[PDB]
Design a binder for this molecule. Sequence first.
Ligand SMILES: [Mg+2]
Ligand SMILES: [Mg+2]
Ligand SMILES: [Mg+2]
Ligand SMILES: [Mg+2]
Ligand SMILES: [Mg+2]
Ligand SMILES: [Mg+2]
Ligand SMILES: [Mg+2]
Ligand SMILES: [Mg+2]
Length: 260
Amino acid sequence: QHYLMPLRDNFEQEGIRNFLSPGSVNMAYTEYQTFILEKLNALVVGTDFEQKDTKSIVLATARDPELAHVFNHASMAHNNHFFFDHLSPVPVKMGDKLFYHINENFGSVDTLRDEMIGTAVSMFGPGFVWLVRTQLPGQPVALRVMATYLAGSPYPGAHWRRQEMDAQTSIGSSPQGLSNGQRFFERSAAGFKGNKLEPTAPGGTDLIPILCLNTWEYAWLREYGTGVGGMGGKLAYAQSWWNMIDWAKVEEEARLETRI
RNA sequence: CGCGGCUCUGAUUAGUGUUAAGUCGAAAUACGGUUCGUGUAGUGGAAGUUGCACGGGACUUAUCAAUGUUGAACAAUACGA
Ligand SMILES: [Mg+2]
Ligand SMILES: [Mg+2]
Ligand SMILES: [Mg+2]
Ligand SMILES: [Mg+2]
Ligand SMILES: [Mg+2]
Ligand SMILES: [Mg+2]
Ligand SMILES: [Mg+2]
Ligand SMILES: [Mg+2]
């Protein structure tokens, strides 16, 4: 069965300094990751996914419509742990290599800050904001910001559930609305018939998530309160998060090829 | 003296044993060229042969017109003689 694993630096015991109280991280990871794994176990208790890993269940249950409920619990457990696994007990100084690509791609580290934080609030819904690394066979490494919805995964092997654009406020009769609507059916029709829209490289090496931001309410509603009056809330939660990012590890997983 | 038993003999007559170098057929052993044998009743130079029922110690010697299957798609980081 799938069991809960400890956190990075005993966050469950002490928690982050000025980002999450030990009681909040307890309700956010222990009392929730355990709840998700209990449901995940019941769904794979007697199937081939019984001994498979979370990410393996994600890629294997991405397109199958009869396993969408299994994808949620598997993808949620993977995304949730991916969030806490990149937090540092003490602020870290951004490396030189990473500090270069961020400025070359987004213009400035402060610009990337507002883009991710701005996307978290602009999304108005529980999800995850990713910092993806895209590198086509001919093009160089390029960093962008991808925002997934409730349990969507950023990996290319699970593009079937790359839930990054709501349909209730993005598909309409307006000029931009019709464009989104066309792309909607173009994906559903292409995916259904098996055709691929964007050619990808083998092994899903195109997109490599490096950083994540969990915007679900169970992670900040208790600590930063609702947010009425401009104090705390989902806004301050995203701001304080930006200070505890493990830029040392973020740069590592990025694997920015040295060319300077 | 009679009857019975026993022994020997008897014109004439039957059977069987032995005997490589004769004669006439070819009945059996192979589907032995009419399946062979048992019983019973006939028949023919001889072995044979005929009827009727019976036995296998003769047919288990037996070896597909059911003609033999798209038994749940494809693609993925799954899969890799
Ligand atoms: Mg005499
Ligand atoms: Mg005869
Ligand atoms: Mg004869
Ligand atoms: Mg005969
Ligand atoms: Mg006879
Ligand atoms: Mg006659
Ligand atoms: Mg015979
Ligand atoms: Mg015989």
